[PDB]
Ligand binder design. Structure first.
Ligand SMILES: NC(=O)c1ccc[n+]([C@@H]2O[C@H](COP(=O)([O-])OP(=O)(O)OC[C@H]3O[C@@H](n4cnc5c(N)ncnc54)[C@H](O)[C@@H]3O)[C@@H](O)[C@H]2O)c1
Length: 319
């Protein structure tokens, strides 16, 4: 398996399958796609409490284990603690809920989805009558301490974070009494937001950057501005793709791979799922990597504007 070593010694497959379910996409479609992904050969599956599909991911995994397609030990399952569950007393029960949905005894990786907490409750996106998000005040170091307890309980193999900036990572890392460092920071990262400064920081601290939106996202309009540029139609990308005899998607993934990043790739289409697994079969030259570095625009498809009115909103800082 093409894997990257985490700072706790665990191995993460270097390409993961994404499972965000758009608002209009039925759960049955998420289930089918996850089943197919396992047949196609994906081993790393990335999901989240807030995606509403852990049950479907759990069904896909157990049905494919029962059929002999895969064994649990062959899979790397990530899920994410949602903002409404950051209060320390809610963390382990939220993980236990997710494990039940997933039909798993443990997950391979459990991460804080953002550094910003939200009002606790069943609603994942609590708002007032004006539609303003109801946020909360909870030190992410206090949430982190409970993730450490989850790991010590054997409910999760590795723990990490998502959508943290370098100051926020520093706060965890420099906290007196810290037990375990985050193994990863999962962030938006792609040719238009190449994260070079955050990447260099993470490398210096032995933290792996896991890239979502690696292909420019599925462009689900609940979260992604419809006027955003279409990464896979970029002219420089398409020229590099033609020169290398690979698809634009494969170039965009390989770019990240060669920088030590673990990209996620989502598709519902079988041949796209199949093609993305080809990313370990070719290499990009230093000249083409230089060309691809030139595409950075500091452009975020997923700015999480619903979290903006909070001092831990992560994306104001330079990196
Ligand atoms: N941690 C976070 O805050 C966070 C937030 C959002 C999503 N995610 C995760 O990131 C995953 C990836 O993000 P995403 O789902 O938005 O999409 P993505 O960037 O992987 O984009 C998927 C799009 O790429 C296209 N595509 C895929 N393979 C292709 C191929 N070989 N050729 C041509 N086109 C191809 C498809 O059209 C698809 O709609 C999610 O599914 C989810 O698991 C994480």
């Amino acid at each position: 398996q093409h894997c990257v070593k985490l700072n706790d010694g665990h191995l993460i497959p270097a390409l993961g399958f994404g499972t965000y379910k758009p608002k209009e996409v039925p759960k049955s479609k998420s289930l089918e796609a996850a089943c197919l992904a396992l047949d196609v050969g994906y081993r790393h599956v990335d999901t989240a409490y807030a995606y509403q599909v852990e049950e479907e991911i759990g069904q896909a995994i157990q049905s494919k284990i029962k059929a002999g397609v895969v064994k649990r030990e062959d899979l790397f399952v990530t899920t994410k603690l949602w903002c409404t569950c950051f209060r320390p007393e809610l963390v382990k029960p939220a993980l236990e809920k997710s494990l039940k949905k997933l039909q798993l005894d443990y997950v391979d990786l459990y991460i804080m989805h953002y550094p910003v907490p939200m009002k606790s409750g069943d609603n994942d996106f609590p708002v007032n009558e004006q539609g303003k998000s109801l946020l909360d005040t909870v030190d992410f170091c206090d949430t982190w301490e409970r993730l450490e307890e989850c790991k010590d309980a054997g409910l999760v193999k590795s723990i990490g974070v998502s959508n943290f900036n370098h100051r926020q990572l520093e706060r965890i890392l420099n906290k007196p009494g810290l037990k375990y460092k985050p193994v990863c920071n999962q962030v938006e990262c792609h040719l238009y937001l190449n994260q070079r400064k955050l990447l260099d920081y993470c490398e210096s601290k032995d933290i792996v950057l896991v890239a979502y939106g690696a292909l420019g996202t599925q462009r689900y309009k609940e979260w992604v501005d419809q006027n955003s540029p279409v990464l896979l139609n970029d002219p420089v990308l398409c020229d590099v793709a033609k020169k290398n005899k690979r698809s634009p998607a494969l170039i965009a993934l390989r770019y990240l791979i060669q920088r030590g990043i673990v990209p996620l790739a989502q598709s519902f289409k079988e041949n796209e799922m199949r093609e993305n697994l080809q990313v370990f079969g070719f290499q990009l030259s230093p000249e083409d990597m230089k060309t691809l570095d030139g595409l950075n625009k500091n452009f975020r498809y997923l700015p999480a504007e619903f979290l903006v009115d909070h001092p831990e909103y992560p994306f104001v800082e330079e990196y």
